[PDB]
C-alpha cells in the first residue's frame, strides 16, 4: 500500500483542435493501454514479478495556443473513451464510435477538478505479471527455424485495448492545442516474488538495454 499510494504520471498525449486542412487527425489522439511510458512508477512495480491491485485513474488537462493564432475559442469539453479489445475504433474525431453505448467514457469540462475514477483488477490471469518468459502462440514445425522472434515476452501478449481521447467541440478559427496527462495509482495492492531494481536505462515496452548507458 503506502509505497505505491501515489498518483504517478504515465503518458502525456497531444491533441490539437484546429480548422486547418490536415488537422482532422490532430483533433483526437489514441493511446495503447500500457504503463511503460514513464520510468518512475514502472521501476517501483518492476520490483516484483507479479502484482494484483485495483486502479485509480486521474487525468490532468492543459490547453494552450500554438502559433500567433492567439484569438478566440470557447471552453473545451473533452472525452476520454476506453476502447476494449475487438471493438469499433474511430474513423475521425466526431463519429459514431465515440457515442459509447458500452465503451466506458469520461466527459471533462475544462477548468473543473481533475476527472478521476476507479477500475477493478480486470486482468485475465489470477495476478498481473510484469514479466513473461515465453512466447505468445507456439511456432510449429514447418514454419521457420528462426521463428518466435517478435512474439516473445510480455510486449507480444499483454493487449488491453486503447484509450481514445478527443475534444468534443468543433474546430474554431484559431487553433488550440491540449496536453492530457494520465495518472495512475495502484491501490488494494499485493505483490509476489521480489526482484532487483532496474539499474540501467529502459528501452520501451520490453526489458531491453542500450549500449551507451549500462
Amino acid at each position: 500500500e503506502s509505497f505505491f499510494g501515489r498518483a504517478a504520471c504515465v503518458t502525456i498525449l497531444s491533441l490539437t483542435n484546429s480548422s486547418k486542412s490536415g488537422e482532422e487527425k490532430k483533433h483526437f489522439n489514441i493511446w495503447n493501454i500500457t504503463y511503460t511510458d514513464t520510468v518512475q512508477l514502472r521501476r517501483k512495480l518492476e520490483f516484483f514479478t507479479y502484482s494484483r491491485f485495483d486502479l485509480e485513474m486521474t487525468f490532468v488537462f492543459t490547453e494552450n495556443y500554438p502559433s500567433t493564432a492567439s484569438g478566440e475559442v470557447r471552453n473545451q469539453v473533452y472525452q476520454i473513451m476506453y476502447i476494449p479489445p475487438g471493438a469499433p475504433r474511430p474513423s475521425s474525431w466526431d463519429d459514431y464510435t465515440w457515442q459509447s453505448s458500452s465503451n466506458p467514457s469520461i466527459f471533462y469540462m475544462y477548468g473543473n477538478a481533475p476527472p478521476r475514477m476507479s477500475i477493478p483488477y480486470v486482468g485475465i490471469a489470477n495476478a498481473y505479471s510484469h514479466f513473461y518468459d515465453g512466447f505468445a502462440r507456439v511456432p510449429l514445425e514447418g514454419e521457420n527455424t528462426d521463428a518466435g522472434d517478435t512474439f516473445y515476452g510480455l510486449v507480444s501478449i499483454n493487449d488491453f485495448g486503447v484509450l481514445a481521447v478527443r475534444a468534443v467541440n468543433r474546430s474554431n478559427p484559431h487553433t488550440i492545442h491540449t496536453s492530457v496527462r494520465v495518472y495512475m495509482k495502484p491501490k488494494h495492492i499485493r505483490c509476489w516474488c521480489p526482484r532487483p531494481p532496474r539499474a540501467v536505462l529502459y528501452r520501451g515496452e520490453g526489458v531491453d538495454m542500450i549500449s551507451s548507458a549500462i
Binding site: 503518458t11 502525456i12 498525449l13 497531444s14 490539437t16 489522439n29 511510458d37 514513464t38 496536453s179
Partner: peptide, 5 residues
C-alpha cells in the same frame, strides 16, 4: 518524452 505536436 516525445509528445506528438
Amino acid at each position: 518524452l516525445i509528445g506528438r505536436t
